[PDB]
Amino acid sequence: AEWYWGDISREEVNEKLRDTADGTFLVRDYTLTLRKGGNNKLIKIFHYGFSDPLTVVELINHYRNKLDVKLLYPVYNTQFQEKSREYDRLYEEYTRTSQEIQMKRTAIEAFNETIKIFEEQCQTQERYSKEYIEKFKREGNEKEIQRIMHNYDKLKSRISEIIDSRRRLEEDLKKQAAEYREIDKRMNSIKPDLIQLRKTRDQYLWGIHLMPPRILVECLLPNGMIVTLECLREATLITIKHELFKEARKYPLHQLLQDESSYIFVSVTQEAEREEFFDETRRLCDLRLFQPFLKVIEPVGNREEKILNREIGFAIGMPVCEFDMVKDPEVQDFRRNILNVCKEAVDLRDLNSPHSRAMYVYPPNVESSPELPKHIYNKLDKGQIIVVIWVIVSPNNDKQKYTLKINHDCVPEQVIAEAIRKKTRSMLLSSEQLKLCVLEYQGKYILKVCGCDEYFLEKYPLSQYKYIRSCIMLGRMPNLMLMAKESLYSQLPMDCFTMPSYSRSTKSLWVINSALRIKILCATYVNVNIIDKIYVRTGIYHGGEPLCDNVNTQRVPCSNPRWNEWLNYDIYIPDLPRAARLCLSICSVKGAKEEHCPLAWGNINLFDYTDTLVSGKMALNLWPVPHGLEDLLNPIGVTGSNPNKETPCLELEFDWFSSVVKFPDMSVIEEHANWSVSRELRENDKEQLKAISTRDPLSEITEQEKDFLWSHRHYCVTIPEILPKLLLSVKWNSRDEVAQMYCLVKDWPPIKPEQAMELLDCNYPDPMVRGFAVRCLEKYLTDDKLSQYLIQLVQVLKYEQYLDNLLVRFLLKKALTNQRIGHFFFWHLKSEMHNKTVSQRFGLLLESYCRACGMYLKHLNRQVEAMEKLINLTDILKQEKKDETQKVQMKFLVEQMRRPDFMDALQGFLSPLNPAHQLGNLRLEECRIMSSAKRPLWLNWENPDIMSELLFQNNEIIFKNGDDLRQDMLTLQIIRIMENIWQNQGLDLRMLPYGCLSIGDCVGLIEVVRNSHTIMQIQCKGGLKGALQFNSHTLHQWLKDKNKGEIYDAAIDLFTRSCAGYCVATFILGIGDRHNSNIMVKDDGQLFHIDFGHFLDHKKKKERVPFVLTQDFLIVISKGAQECTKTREFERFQEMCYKAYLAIRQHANLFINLFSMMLGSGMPELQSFDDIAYIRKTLALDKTEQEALEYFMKQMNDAHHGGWT
């Protein structure tokens, strides 16, 4: 048959029905996919009919004759590489030009503020100079007239050079803007052709880095005089102000000047802010002045708040005054209302002082559960662990130690008690005297991990602390230091929280009888080549699902984007769900199959945060299209206008009703729900419900199953984890069904947080659904799990419709009551602030955090400053140094890191990877640029801790610039979760999820693993065997040299086990292709991988086993024999792989969710849901356990050419 496609993937079926007419259909292995109402409906066919009784080609023709009508419509490689390479070259110039334009627009604003201040200076000068010249003229002085006019000559000459500089920059911007539009036009012509060419392929100071040692700054006095003052670059504003007022006595009109104590300095900054400097401690070179000038004004406003606002704006990367001028009431309501969360968190952590404040700053670092897996309890002997308690005596740092043997699960106070028992053994204390000495030490002291800042402040069993637990795993001696609480409490400054200064008829939607219509008026411009026609494509979406077929305006010549057309959507105003959004775009049609492409896009919430339906006329500035998005609309994108107004602006008009239209309140919804039920339980049913709740979030659900789930919706309460599948069964364009769903959700039973997190992704926009998910997290989500999943929870904030919601308030409360959560809460937000889509939401949330976070803001600012100097330095190497040989680059590195300004910033701060790790003085001999192509930085710090010798004496981080490390973070997160699953199932497989943190745009930090080498580095320690060929046995021989004696077997074991872990994990996730420089081995034999920046389907345009065991690894697993495949050790290696693969398959739902919550980000290789489907295929979810294991073997076989059977 013509419409029978046999076996084809769901992703391929969606591609054929995309943007088609209602009635389009096909059939596959049976399964009938039908296009209705803008969606693709799935109608199953049983071996034939749709439902009992069964009455094949026969029934398909009968229906060609809920769902109304259907069955109308059944369903060079050198040129693609030539067009694709050109497109990527234009995209490079497109983003560089886009970024350079932003810096210029900011510099124009700095020029405007500068010229405004200088124009004020001329006015005040003309004011005072006017009256005193007339007096001096009357008196015939003529010396004072000349002196005044002499200073006015310099002022007028100075202000003219600034106006000339602004005019010169405006013209350069005007030129580069026109160049940006042309680049935009060239890419808009290639997009349709490049897609078509690929489809057929498949068918077969400002500007000055630093100030000079002495600099000349022009001080603008309130009497109108401009005075030149030579300053040391490091001089404080205190010194500058005092010297300035000595020099002012040499200038005319001195007597008008008040005392210097009555004034402060104001100036302009590289961020184009007009900044009053209330803190006069600050050095001149640290002010980030736009130009070298200062204006003397009288201070206005609260001193302490202005000082704090500067510190906040530095951490945020944006001036706080920019939020003051936003006229959007939702923005100003969020700033004021979110302070309620700040006050609760501050009140909660101060409840029992100092202790609860210490619990906030140094929260216990602890595993999820006290229960130890069986093989871990066997590592410790008899149930007891040997720990070393250290005491510091005398100012000389001399340290006495006491070795204890105690139960693994005994608490920290019981450990301290045993230290006292061992010390007092010979003192012959009575039973009561021993109790008194133990109670004193338990009260006066706590335990601290030697080598970092980590403390046991809480009653958790000792084996549950991450540090002790790690020691048990690794077979290392725990080293703890006895420390007085009074020393820890003075280490925490008591801080107070001050409220900022900004703390101070209608109608019903369901009443309107009418359909939904929106008028498209016109667009200011678009960038296209005179492409044939353009049009505005619109649609109404709930989540990613359309609520009705898309509606287009009429086509119009590119020269004239005017429509003035009413678009009629099929849907009923009372049927419009609360979370419905309007998604629209401007598209072009090249004249040929009519290739379409999306010039620009934008989204709108059809109800504002007050539940008001949009009305009247609206102007919407649109957004550039994301890199690899070929769809004509972008429902995942963020709502709201583009803050950049230099971009195409579409004008809309919304239907008007006699008054304001509001969404109904809950009492009317429930009353409507009872009205719908009024006008409207077998063993196999209970088993089908159980079966539907097990399948993965991305599994297909037919229409017969959606009706089955909805008919049984009242019985679904007994299987609460089925809720996501039930929500998909709802018709969200019917208020009758949504009203009933609300009455279920409010009473719905709670569910596990890992399951509730799914309801926070882009598929579940509804407020009631989302509010239910957050209440689930509020009760059942521990601070440990919240830390693990924090990258996903921060990501789903983007899909929230409004600034003020339940999820934001939950996360901010937790960040402000837990400083380990707050640290990464801050950095996850700060890294995306470059992204203008989320920059306002995240900027506002960082402000609220920084106000209530307490004394930690000083430490965060220290980290932000240090990262800025590393970003600046590495960006220089990317541009200037990009050519010259690495021998020269290292000369520039050692020279730049030697600057005392650089040295002060990069020494004595906390590692953003692990705030518990203090970063001391840099060891510069160890600092280098790595020899890899991307040329990242290798940085080495001393550990300042007195006990550092017992943990590590050097901290090493890789600072990598130019790659997006959010993908590494997701992989390393998944690696860690995979290991915890395997560990709790009795499989001991060591994985190495080293720390990775993205601090900005394609910039971040990576933890260095000590005592590790790449396979390449190890083969080079060896020698050649065949012609121009490394020896296959070098790796195995190297491990023999590192592990000799009885420890040899332990290394081969650890090698084989860790090798099994990265075989399974790498195959499941589709990690980028492995090679000898991204694979590594420790001295003990533990194997791990690096360079995780690729995952899933990324080779789709251009599956596979990334990690392929070569002769080198098989020699180690089999302990150096010949024919490694036939050995019993390689069989045992395969068993580990098979068992570890099935373990992940059972947990598949968790990992699919983790990827789904990340869709909103700009990660290049995670774009649509079809990218996540790669994991469905590698885990063989739609298959069965027996078949899925056979699937894994066949993939390993084909990649290794035999050996698996």
Ligand SMILES: COc1ccc(-c2cc(CNc3ccc(S(=O)(=O)Nc4nnc(C)s4)cc3)cc(C(=O)O)c2)cn1
């Ligand atoms: C259970 O559903 C509802 C929805 C709204 C109201 C409702 C309406 C109004 C005023 N709006 C309105 C407009 C058109 C007509 S119609 O009869 O001429 N057309 C039609 N009839 N059935 C359809 C189907 S469409 C009636 C009312 C007011 C109130 C109220 O006063 O509470 C409630 C009551 N129940």
Ligand SMILES: COc1ccc(-c2cc(CNc3ccc(S(=O)(=O)Nc4nnc(C)s4)cc3)cc(C(=O)O)c2)cn1
């Ligand atoms: C769009 O305009 C419409 C839509 C539907 C209807 C409509 C009226 C009726 C009349 N009876 C009726 C039934 C239920 C209740 S309720 O209080 O329980 N629900 C609610 N109240 N205010 C709202 C608001 S919705 C109130 C009146 C019946 C029907 C019908 O059942 O088809 C439709 C009327 N206008």
Ligand SMILES: COc1ccc(-c2cc(CNc3ccc(S(=O)(=O)Nc4nnc(C)s4)cc3)cc(C(=O)O)c2)cn1
């Ligand atoms: C994590 O512990 C590590 C990691 C790497 C090295 C290491 C690697 C190499 C050569 N391999 C290599 C491959 C990829 C890149 S990357 O910049 O493109 N991405 C990334 N880098 N680290 C990650 C992590 S991901 C850099 C180097 C050489 C050396 C060395 O020079 O000693 C150390 C040592 N310890």
